[PDB]
Design a protein around this ligand. Sequence first.
Ligand SMILES: [Cu+2]
Ligand SMILES: [Cu+2]
Ligand SMILES: [Cu+2]
Ligand SMILES: [Cu+2]
Ligand SMILES: [Cu+2]
Ligand SMILES: [Cu+2]
Ligand SMILES: [Zn+2]
Ligand SMILES: [Zn+2]
Ligand SMILES: [Zn+2]
Lengths: 333, 333, 333
Amino acid sequence: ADKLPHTKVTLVAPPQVHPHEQATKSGPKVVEFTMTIEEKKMVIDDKGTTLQAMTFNGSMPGPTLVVHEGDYVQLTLVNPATNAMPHNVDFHGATGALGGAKLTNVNPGEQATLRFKADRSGTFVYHCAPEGMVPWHVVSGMSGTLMVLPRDGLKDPQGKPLHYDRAYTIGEFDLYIPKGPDGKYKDYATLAESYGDTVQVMRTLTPSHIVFNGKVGALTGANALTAKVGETVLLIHSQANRDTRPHLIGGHGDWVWETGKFANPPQRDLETWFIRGGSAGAALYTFKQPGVYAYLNHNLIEAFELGAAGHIKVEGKWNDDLMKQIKAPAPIP
Amino acid sequence: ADKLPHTKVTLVAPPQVHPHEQATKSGPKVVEFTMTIEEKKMVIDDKGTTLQAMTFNGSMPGPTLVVHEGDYVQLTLVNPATNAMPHNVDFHGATGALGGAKLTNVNPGEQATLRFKADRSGTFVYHCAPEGMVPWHVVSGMSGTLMVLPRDGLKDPQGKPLHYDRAYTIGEFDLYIPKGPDGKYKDYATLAESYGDTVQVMRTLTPSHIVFNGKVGALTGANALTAKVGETVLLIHSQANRDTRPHLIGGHGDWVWETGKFANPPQRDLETWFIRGGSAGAALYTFKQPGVYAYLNHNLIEAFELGAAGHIKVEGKWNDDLMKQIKAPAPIP
Amino acid sequence: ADKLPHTKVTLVAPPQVHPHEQATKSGPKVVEFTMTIEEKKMVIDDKGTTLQAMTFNGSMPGPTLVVHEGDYVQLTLVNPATNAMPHNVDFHGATGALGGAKLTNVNPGEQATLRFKADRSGTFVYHCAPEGMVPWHVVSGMSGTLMVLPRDGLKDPQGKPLHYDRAYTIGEFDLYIPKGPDGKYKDYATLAESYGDTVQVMRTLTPSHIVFNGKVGALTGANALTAKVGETVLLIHSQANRDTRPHLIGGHGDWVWETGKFANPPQRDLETWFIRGGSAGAALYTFKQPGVYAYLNHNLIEAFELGAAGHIKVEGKWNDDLMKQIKAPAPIP
Ligand SMILES: [Cu+2]
Ligand SMILES: [Cu+2]
Ligand SMILES: [Cu+2]
Ligand SMILES: [Cu+2]
Ligand SMILES: [Cu+2]
Ligand SMILES: [Cu+2]
Ligand SMILES: [Zn+2]
Ligand SMILES: [Zn+2]
Ligand SMILES: [Zn+2]
């Protein structure tokens, strides 16, 4: 590892993913990343409910880190003195030391640097895991995805090449916001004060909200995802704590690795796939019709009532062979 | 599509599936179907609890529509003036326009005709999805399965032929029936009056009932499914809103497409498979022993307490090689 | 079957699995086992909560039975007069008679002997299933795993040999312990007295506890699982009633059959896999780093709050290529 060239990657905010190559002629590198933890109160719904949140780099989810199989990930994790809690990081993509958590315990005002070999291809969850407060840090927002691409790019079941033209990252967060005697959601002055009440809601296993990217409607309106007919999108979906079942309304998973590990053949033509709590998965879809699609958790209560749904606005020409309104709504003859 | 021969299919009520060919020499057709929406109060359990239900063709689930890959599905959806609500249809088997929902918005007294190309093989959920009331219409009963068979029939992982002699369709419905201050289930005079109370139960994510084909015990007694030793059955299982885990007690999934998409190799020898909420899956089993089998959701609370279980009565000769009572129950020596 | 040699297997208590061969030159046998049912009150958590439990052989889960594909399993099931309830056994590995339940109905003071052909390879749940009380017997602890190995051992997707050096069996139990008006868990004088209150908790679908091997912390401290760097472990995970999502923190599923059926190719490099309620699955992992790993259900609430987590203590030499602390926690420059 010490013989290798180093490279420095600038991260970008979800739902985007930082520029990267798929298939590459480059040999292994030590790829250097930095993330800074930010605790903060966030508004998570249309009615102004707040979450005492914890984030990597200020976002839910954290940014997606992209490397290739055989690369070494070298992360500097920074925990500013303005934060209240200790933190660390557990990479599911890593081998040893509780995913790196044991080696990255950072109090406010501290930082650490971890290196590990990304020797397995796939999308992998990373998350905070401080001893004794693991679920709280995770459900409060401290997770994201490491994508380790195969050096020669994605392959189908027959070993033929697959690619995406555009990649999006979606983190789905089951939230456990307490209510007071009046049935209204509680607003907490500090992160520490939210703790006890939150654990109580957590233990019921019933989320109050389930949101993409930190808020009801985060991926809608001005913030809808975008594509054009003929473009192939990669949709990375992470859920660090609870199962979900992604679905693209009016579309499909053309090729899907629902367990998220690229050395396995993908499945094709999926209507709905399954992301296990504690994992990230990946779906390819090539758009064939223009219009506004919904991308959602297909427990439709979890989607429409609780918040697990976004939109993708697709430009291009309508295709009558694929779908045609033969007769519009009109009185019954 | 306009060059093709049209064919007209008569639908049948679940658990049966309309006569169809598996492997076929026929070229692509425009296959024409009609469904009429019926809202109605249904009795859903042994104690007389009612559901203000909504159905395609009067049944939960709707009838299964069967075509071949490359066919065009052409559906006339009828919403009689005797209904109270608007409806539409979203085919997961279709590409574009939110699965056809945007093109099939029918008020009571209206109808519409949608065509789409069934270009992907598998079992696919179809369901009602009116803007702003999607989960309610789905959980109230408005879903079913489109089966798109490969033109050359089902294949195993090695590409060898598979077939069924008999097909059954099972729709599993998580119901959210409200209770009054007395703890008794509420009985509603109209569909509209059930709405607010139902959404409240929905948001708890805890079903009051989980039933096959519209009622506790729907597929039991006089209504048990049937087969004989040596016959291969296809069990189509749809769940449009919530995960389930089918299991045949005393049997197996000989070949199972749990994600329901026939271009993928099936898995063999399954004890229990997994249907993601928002999908339909398909299992083949060839009976080897006679007797009454249970086919159920293997969360046994969901099965035995909540209603997710049916029976299959199997004729034929017992096989001592497969199973033998060596010593019947008798006092401990 | 009557022509075959008989062999007699002595069972061992979980998390161990009785000595057995993987690939074998031996032809089919009638493999004889005996299990004795024990009902008993068990302490299930750190605060002294009790469960009115029911067990095969005194343990949760029951012991794992291991045979080869083509063998006949011949089980003597004993229900001592000191027990209060009738019992039986349903082998998911078996064909006919509700998995053998119909042929093994044993009242206290009775026993029975069942034979069946283990004609399908994989890990399969077995559980008690007395008519009218199936979920109660299962959730109270009456389940375990039958492992049917392929005669020529485990194989990878390409048909190359796989093996384990050490096998562990983990049964995960969703428990439904009632509470009294004071919010404290109830302590019941007899098994029968726990019944009504328990069914009520069951119907909420919310477990009070979710535990590995009968107790919070069962597989921790003195009782942690063990291995060394370079050793391959098989982790058998059974869940007879509810879904779970196993994860090894700092490790992976090198080869995983999450549906648990060995004639299917395994998936590789998994971070988290999925065991469907009503099944057993199997993962291989070869240790590469020393240290204390956690093996847990990656719904982290279910793990850390409810009890679904154990430890594996691994001996050996640290590997800096796989992971290295480049800079330990230190003040931010
Ligand atoms: Cu943290
Ligand atoms: Cu984790
Ligand atoms: Cu409708
Ligand atoms: Cu849908
Ligand atoms: Cu029992
Ligand atoms: Cu069972
Ligand atoms: Zn492209
Ligand atoms: Zn046949
Ligand atoms: Zn070995």
